[model samples]
Target: NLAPLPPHVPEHLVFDFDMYNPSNLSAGVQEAWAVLQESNVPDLVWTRCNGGHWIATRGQLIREAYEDYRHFSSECPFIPREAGEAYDFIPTSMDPPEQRQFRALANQVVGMPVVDKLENRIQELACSLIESLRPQGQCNFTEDYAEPFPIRIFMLLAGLPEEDIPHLKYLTDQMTRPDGSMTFAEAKEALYDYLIPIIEQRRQKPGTDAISIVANGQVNGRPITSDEAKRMCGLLLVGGLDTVVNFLSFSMEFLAKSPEHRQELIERPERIPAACEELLRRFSLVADGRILTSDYEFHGVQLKKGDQILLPQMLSGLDERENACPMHVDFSRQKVSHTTFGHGSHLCLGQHLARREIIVTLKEWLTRIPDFSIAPGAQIQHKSGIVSGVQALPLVWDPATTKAV
Candidate 1:
């Protein structure tokens, strides 16, 4: 059910789209969202759903809106007024000039240099985890590889205990895709409670871990506050844990069904990098919004002050105007442009690490278990949210067909 459409909104531009749970979700997350671009729908529409927020459906509108930060503020990026009001995850929740100061400190933890350092461990872990499951011939890809692969890496980087993942992940999930378990504020408070002591400990006795570095990290040549450290570290944790973990499942889910696509990458091992870009485009699954600072006419649509516009980072690449044959996964197709890593100044800082994880998973998993498919007669379920996810991906194959290597 949708809230009553505001009187200011034009009747023709109305689209009752819900981000948390879309009507076309049974098809696929991206497929469900692609309906927005259908000829009948406008490039930008005002949905009474989720409290009458605006949606930028076309790539041009999405990109334009993202680049114009002055008009589209990141201050209230989440849906549901309370969650957006409660969302204060450091630089992400902030705009440039102010947001820029903390970004450098964030990069210190999940930056490329850090990725270069973790390269060996990332490869080893992917191989180790995949090899362990290689003999099983069947495994829940989501629980087995998707969750552990990127998460364990994030845990190591943050200097957090692996055992704490369940609690922490649950808390993180609540903010992005609440299962009615808790409100965003409650979830955020729990995260802060857990991070506070660790941050405090790391502040006193600094270690080489990310939390320690942030705890003691200087901002603009000044020491950062414990509260600031916890807030910033919390953002890093969410970005690290959620991004690749969900993407891996979306990519693998496609590969399991598309043998030709799998064989293409397996046959041309060098194409893994190119394939990674296409998969990211096709399976791109992030949808965050920005608040309108003041009354403004965009793409001929009038938006009021405090209006929230969900510029789905995923929609840009899938827009036919941006990519030809938008739905098809064409690795060889030239010009794979997307805002999946976002646009303008807020481009995803952890994208380098994400690309590596995706490439490594495809190469490693295919190298060992080249021929696999969704478990026979099993229906794969996908959940939608700020960060859409695959509910379950039961993959199956024969051990005899798998290689020990």
Candidate 2:
């Protein structure tokens, strides 16, 4: 039932890693790619699963592919053609000239200026959220803090109602890591249905919020259309909701397990920012790749045109060649190089906001409950896809350590 590879394809270079279920025989999704580093898999391998695609195992190749967008087209940027086609989010899906205009609109809202304006609110939210959980002594980190904090902040930034978060988050999850019940088309249509009205309302009477800024902004010297604005907004909503929510959970989970690392921040509070960077580098979630437009050879391996390439964004930091003892969390690394946010033109635009959120959470959480860890007898599990994250992180701490406001 497998499709034959294009002519001139080599046997050993087969990219058969099942991003959906990557392990050799494990039911876990994307286990093949996730386990490759542990097994010493080469820098690049061809996967026969998911219609067969090339995977860049190391940071170097991943960075090269992202930088050289010519060879790897962003037009169809996912595993299956259907999913790729459905990922037509503005700026991300669009290449170069067309992409530039929308990128400007996105920068207008989530860029440095917006983050500066929101610094106080961000700090306030972080403190409030952590303080509420301090006395509980035990809390589900994912649901209690990670999920709500970023999503609520995003909703606040977009000027949308917090009541709509649960619904929006559900829809966004379906698009990224589908339950398989709904087709890509069905999910996409539902997204459009929700986005259209929002875009129209913003277009008619623009507000100072991120959504209104994009809805009323100009792209390519002309005003962006309602459809284009809707698409762009949809991507922003997904990015805001998914990226940081999972990122916070991962960072907190890591800190809980690694007490020495936690103590480093607690003692040297000034180092929290660097610690945040190192953690982002180490955990680097988000596996995304591009489809090769033409056949090419790299590192002596031949790649055929139209072959989908899996660029494991998370594995880059794990490459020992790039970072010494890639798995170790070294906050003092002179140069913290990792493509978690991304590389080159495709680098994450909203990264600054995400970083701010991470730093604020770390500083604030430790200030309240400095010592916390995984609750006794609790297990943590990870899920993967366009966005990879832990299912749950049950944390417990001594109530006496909690400080009163």
Candidate 3:
């Protein structure tokens, strides 16, 4: 059902596009989203979908919105109003000065330094997962490798049990891509219910896990409160479970289809890092936005107070103005311009971990199984939401061509 347009919004600015279920999803998630970038579309449009919020369609507006946190606040970051109102994830939900303190503690867990510490584990896990699937000739890349590799690495780091992934993942998915089974508040409360006891236990007797570290860590020279700890951990858990897991599927799906791209990486393994950046830019998939703090004129559009405008990080790199031939993945592209990880004060904290996971997956997978493609008769589907994802990637190859290394 289309939302009734607000009186403040003009008819010409409306584009009825749903972020969770894009209309042209059959083509590709990113391609479907690129519809906003079509020449006929406005740079900023008010979508009468997902409860009638504004969307900043171009890179210029998206960057401006993210950078100007005062007017464009992260207070209510999700669309559909309900989720955004319920969202209290630390650092992400809070603005700067106040938001700054929690980031340092969050960084202690997922920042570059932590990535350095976990490098061997990340490499080993990628090799193990890829090697196990090498001789299969075919694999559900989404289920078999993409989910477990980054997810399990995160589970280990957080000191959470592997058995809890399904429960946690379901709740996390609900918040991002609701199946209509549970409301965002319901899913969020459930996650907090699961986290509360664990947080309480960890506070009593701290462990070396990410949760325990966060549970006991200080904020601004004062001890972090239980409520604060839960909110921060909730953000960490969702970030760990969803971000890289979904991204890998998009990157690998591309690799399976484009032997030319795969061959480029295979021929020059050193380009894997550059290839990873290109892939991140091309396949970038997280899109969430901010609530308008006050009425503000942005790029000639009159945005009213309390208006929610989506600033899609995915759209940033895809803008031709930002990167020419944006859809084409070029490993050698001199300037891989993007805000894929996000921008401004609330930029994604797990980016270092994400890059390592992507680079390691590319290098290790290409080193072993260099040739692969979409399975016969398999048409890949993508899911769009706060974090866009490939539904299922069925990749096929000749096992005989794979090297055990």
Candidate 4:
């Protein structure tokens, strides 16, 4: 359902693509979205699918839009006008100088230092989970290991109970990949309702958990307010629960389909880091845009103030202009370019921890269950939204060949 074209938008520039449910998803989410990059399509086209918006189809345009925050504001980052308008997650909703201090505190919770501190736990969890599944021969990768490893660790870090994951993850999904059961406002309210009491408790009796750190954290040399803490905490919780969860399933599905790719990593274990980068690029899964701050001409197109332009980070490395044969995953690419995590001042805060999780999972899984394939006759379906994901990955292996370690 395309929205009526705005007077400022040229007729020839309309693409009418839907970010949540694109036309060619059956070919695979990344492949489906790559339709915009075909030589015939313009670099910047106005898609009327999600209440009318512009989509930056190439890496050059996407990077520039992300960097030029003055023209492209993160204030309204999500699509469908109402959802973006309702989006109030700190650091992301606020731009630059204002976002910086809160980002610093957010970093305290999920940055490199935090990843370093949690490194052993991350490694232990990956090994434990992989070992437990190694002898099982077949398992639903999505439910079995992918969801638990990173999420359980995040729960540990946040000091939240494991029982709450089902509820928290459901709400987080509604915000990013809505199924129309609730509005963004309603989902935000539910998540906020869940966080309010926890934030209050942590603020009063501070602990080293993430919520407590952010609750008591100083932003701009002042104690963070309860409301501010709730917003920041909400963003952190969503990031923790959503980002890496679906990513692992995608990567694992690829390994299951391509034994040759699996062999490459197993033969040269040292190449795991580089392989992880390539996988991240090939499976780059985030697609959020920015709201235009004012009427402006970009790449020969006029964008009015309040117009939202989707700058899909997933499209960056996938652009053949940036990477040769963008679809193929070559572990030894001399230069890998993509905004899988994100771009500009709003680059994902949890990236370090995410990379650690990916690297550990690849290394550990290959070491234990070295040979696996998708279950015969099972179709692996991909879901498209703010974040694209594999719905389920049923992987099978010969238990006789698996290691207990």
Q: Against the true structure, what is each candidate's TM-score?
A: 0.99, 0.94, 0.99, 0.99
lDDT of 4 by residue, 241-325 (tens): 8889989999999999899999999989899999989999999899998998889999898889989999999999899999999
Task: Please provide, for model 1 over 1-405, each residue's C-alpha lDDT reduced to its tens digit, 9 standing for 90 to 100.
Answer: 688887678999998888998999999888999989999999889888877799999899989988999999999999887899899988888898888888889889888999999999999999999999999889999899999999999999888889999999898899888999799999999999999999988888999999999999999999999989988988988987788999999999899999999899978999999999988999889999999999999888888999888989999999999999999999898899898999998988888889899999999999999999999899888889999999999999998888887
Cα displacement (angstroms), candidate 4, residue 196, comes to 0.6
The superposed Cα distance between candidate 2 and the true structure at residue 354, in angstroms, equals 0.3
Q: Order the candidates by lDDT, highest first — what do you get?
A: 3, 1, 4, 2
Q: How high is the CA lDDT of each candidate model?
A: 0.91, 0.81, 0.91, 0.91
Q: Choose the strongest candidate by lDDT.
A: 3
Candidate 2 backbone overlaps, count: 12
- Alpha-carbon runs more than 4 Å astray in model 3: none
Preferred candidate (TM-score higher): 1 or 2: 1
> What C-alpha lDDT, on a 0 to 100 scale, does residue 249 get in candidate 2?
88
lDDT of 2 by residue, 1-405 (tens): 245775666775554566654454233233335567656466688666667667888788988898888888888887766788777888888777567767878899899999998989988888888878888899999999999888888999999899988888888887777778876667778888887888888788889998899989887689788888888888898899889998888788888988898888989999988998898887787888888778888777777777777787887877777888777789999988778888778778899999999998998888888888899997677776777777888999999977766
User: What does candidate 3's lDDT look like per residue over 1-405, in tens digits?
Assistant: 888889888889889989988999999999999999999999999888878999888899899889998899989999989999999999899888789998999999999989988899988989998988998899998889989998899999999999999999999999988899999999999999999999999999999989999999999899999999999999999998889999999988988888898889888889988998999999999999999888899888888999999999999999999999998889999999999988888878888898889888888899999999998998899999999998899988999999996
- Candidate 3 to truth, TM: 0.99
lDDT score, candidate 1, position 33: 92
